[PDB]
Design an enzyme around this catalytic site. Structure first.
Site, short mmCIF file in Angstrom:
data_model
loop_
_atom_site.label_atom_id
_atom_site.label_comp_id
_atom_site.label_asym_id
_atom_site.label_seq_id
_atom_site.Cartn_x
_atom_site.Cartn_y
_atom_site.Cartn_z
N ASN A 1 96.67 -37.01 93.24
CA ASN A 1 96.68 -35.82 92.42
C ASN A 1 95.30 -35.20 92.34
O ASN A 1 94.29 -35.89 92.22
CB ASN A 1 97.22 -36.18 91.04
CG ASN A 1 98.69 -36.59 91.08
OD1 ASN A 1 99.24 -37.09 90.10
ND2 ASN A 1 99.34 -36.35 92.21
N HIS B 1 93.70 -40.87 89.08
CA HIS B 1 95.09 -40.63 89.52
C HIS B 1 95.24 -40.23 90.99
O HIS B 1 95.26 -39.05 91.35
CB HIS B 1 95.81 -39.61 88.61
CG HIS B 1 95.02 -38.36 88.34
ND1 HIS B 1 94.52 -37.56 89.34
CD2 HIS B 1 94.66 -37.78 87.17
CE1 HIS B 1 93.88 -36.54 88.81
NE2 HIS B 1 93.95 -36.65 87.49
N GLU C 1 85.63 -35.92 81.77
CA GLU C 1 86.13 -35.24 82.96
C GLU C 1 85.41 -33.91 82.97
O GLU C 1 85.42 -33.17 81.98
CB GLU C 1 87.64 -35.04 82.88
CG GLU C 1 88.31 -34.86 84.24
CD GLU C 1 89.75 -35.34 84.26
OE1 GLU C 1 90.65 -34.59 83.81
OE2 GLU C 1 89.98 -36.48 84.73
N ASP D 1 98.93 -39.90 82.95
CA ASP D 1 98.07 -38.76 82.66
C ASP D 1 98.71 -38.04 81.47
O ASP D 1 98.83 -36.82 81.44
CB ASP D 1 98.01 -37.82 83.87
CG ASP D 1 96.75 -36.97 83.88
OD1 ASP D 1 96.76 -35.91 84.56
OD2 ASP D 1 95.76 -37.35 83.23
N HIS E 1 104.67 -36.85 89.52
CA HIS E 1 103.38 -36.50 90.11
C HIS E 1 103.16 -37.12 91.48
O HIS E 1 102.39 -36.61 92.30
CB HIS E 1 102.23 -36.94 89.20
CG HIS E 1 102.16 -36.18 87.91
ND1 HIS E 1 103.11 -36.32 86.92
CD2 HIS E 1 101.25 -35.29 87.45
CE1 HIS E 1 102.78 -35.54 85.90
NE2 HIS E 1 101.66 -34.91 86.19
N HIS F 1 89.64 -34.74 91.12
CA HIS F 1 89.58 -33.27 91.04
C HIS F 1 88.55 -32.83 92.06
O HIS F 1 87.63 -32.07 91.77
CB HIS F 1 89.16 -32.84 89.64
CG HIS F 1 90.24 -33.00 88.62
ND1 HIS F 1 91.35 -32.17 88.58
CD2 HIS F 1 90.42 -33.92 87.65
CE1 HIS F 1 92.16 -32.58 87.63
NE2 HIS F 1 91.63 -33.64 87.05
#
Lengths: 331, 376
Positions: free
Chosen positions: A199, A196, A126, A253, A231, A175
């Site tokens: 999120n 995910h 990541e 997560d 979440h 992200h």
């Protein structure tokens, strides 16, 4: 050699009733009726518990009080921890931009892979390309131990995404603050998985669906989702399940920011999302497996497949976990 | 008595090829094979055009340069008949005029006007769609003013087809009363949370106004009203297919989640079937520049979408079969406002409201009550 009997066994496609799973040499010799069982084999009772292939967690930051330190001991402590909750395989996540930490990670995973087959499957890188040329080539060099990388499609050239995807690495969108168009471009470039869902992504509006809207709209994109009722609201999970069909994977997560374990995730999906236990189990096994390309070895309970299994009671308590044919958890 | 032949005819359930639709006394006598057609009947050719029941637009503010809003001179029966003639030129044979207002006085005139129109023009403008007052532009206890209004609305349920309200701003008792009076209560122009939204559904709401618009964003933690609408299987809802108010991807996602509960609507305003450059609506001054209704600021302020344009856009931009799209513009809306056993399809007994268009989506003819009213 031995066989597991006296309990519903889920193979990944259906539930069998009076059958048995014979394990031998760390592999699943075969799944046959208890009758067809030769007389000379040891029989281990499940006590009515549901038996299924071990859960595959493809998004894990840490568990059992440790996070990925980036050494093989951490990797084996995380493994022992995941087992206590039915998870027999996972992907350690490495958040970092330190090209140095990456090399150690890649090196450590490689060392671990030689010692422990069919457990921690590979690295999940990541960063760096998030939104909160030497690199690319490095990553491709070590595609053998780097299972997947998460990047923001806006922050990365398409050529970079292709190279990663051609090296056999699973490139995931996450992200990010990508627009639908930006998102779609990354899919054409090779991305086939989203980290995910809902999120670290933009909100879905009517004018701009955003990445989430794009993930939901793209049928050929797998994606994980966190079923902890924290979440992601359960209603969004249900909507996603219907839109993603067999492309939705259960992930935790998990860390030392959720504290969700896979059976807890399975329980929540069954009793709060109205998803059949049959499908939920696929979301914790077959689908994740399919998503990271290890399906012809770990997704199901079938002849030749690695013998990684987990058994739990109807009230969702792990009664036993088996890694490579070896009982490692007995409850 | 006559029959329409020589063209694919969509009944609402499937496409028929060598059949015919015989019209008689404003009703559809029957839809049978051309062979079974008696010899003594007049035969009107479609020329290959697709023939389907007229489109039902359940969210219309105005068209042909007029709106059923603001100025008390506009909320009249002439406006209602001008809008009707306009809608026909684009396949829409039935609609619901929307009345945005909090003027208890304007409401009375509206109710009165609709009633007068209903007596003169059967099976066209179906009834009123009251938007406001209970909205949320800037508590399950009912205040005194709520009560006078509610009771008034129920008194006139015969001409008030549906009302849009924000579920957070209204007691549940109010929603029930409206729903029991037979009015379709719709959720819209709300900032409701999923829980708030769900409460209004249990209270009687069964429809949501133009999905994704005037609603909160859908986030992971809070799905909001839109998330609730998408999650509730028994809730009908309209959606604006102009590629402007809602990105086509969201339409596709909605279609899949709502199945047969998604209706095509055109939050159409005066520019619709006209040549207007600018006009007033809701106190705000709107410009129609580039087929895009915007305000002084440049914000989207309504649409100029017609139903065939909507049908075209859903077929060529959302990858929805023409068959389903047509249901979204006829059977579903009909089902949503309870007039299905009279207008949703092409079947014996059903009112003869039809529209026919070419494969390139151009209206070749519109029929209201068995009478050709548009010929092209």
């Amino acid at each position: 050699m031995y066989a597991l009997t006296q309990g519903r066994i889920f193979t990944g496609h259906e539930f069998l009733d009076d059958h048995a799973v014979v394990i031998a040499d760390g592999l699943i010799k075969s799944v046959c009726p208890v009758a067809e069982l030769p007389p000379e084999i040891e029989q281990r009772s499940l006590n009515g518990a549901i038996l299924s292939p071990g859960f595959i967690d493809v998004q894990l930051n840490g568990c059992g009080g440790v996070q990925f330190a980036v050494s093989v001991e951490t990797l084996e402590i995380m493994q022992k921890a995941n087992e206590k909750s039915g998870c027999t395989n996972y992907l350690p996540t490495l958040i970092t931009t330190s090209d140095e930490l990456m090399k150690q990670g890649v090196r450590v995973m490689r060392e671990y892979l030689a010692k422990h087959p069919n457990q921690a499957l590979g690295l999940h890188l990541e960063g760096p390309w998030l939104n909160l040329a030497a690199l690319v080539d490095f990553l491709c060099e070590n595609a053998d131990v780097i299972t997947k990388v998460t990047l923001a499609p806006e922050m990365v050239p398409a050529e970079v995404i292709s190279k990663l995807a051609n090296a056999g690495i699973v490139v995931s969108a996450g992200h990010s603050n990508a627009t639908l168009k930006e998102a779609k471009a990354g899919f054409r470039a090779g991305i086939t998985f989203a980290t995910h869902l809902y999120n670290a992504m933009p909100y879905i509006t009517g004018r701009e669906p955003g990445l989430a809207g794009a993930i939901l709209d793209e049928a050929d994109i797998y994606c994980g989702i966190i079923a902890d009722g924290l979440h992601v609201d359960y209603a969004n999970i249900r909507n996603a399940k219907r839109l993603k069909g067999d492309k939705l994977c259960l992930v935790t997560d998990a860390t030392a920011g959720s504290s969700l374990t896979m059976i807890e995730g399975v329980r929540n999906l069954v009793e709060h999302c109205g998803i059949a236990l049959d499908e939920v189990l696929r979301m914790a096994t077959l689908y994740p497996a399919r998503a990271i390309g290890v399906e012809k070895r770990l997704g199901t309970l079938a002849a030749g497949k690695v013998a990684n299994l987990t058994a739990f009671t109807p009230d969702f308590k792990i009664t036993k976990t088996i890694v490579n044919g070896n009982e490692v958890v007995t409850q």
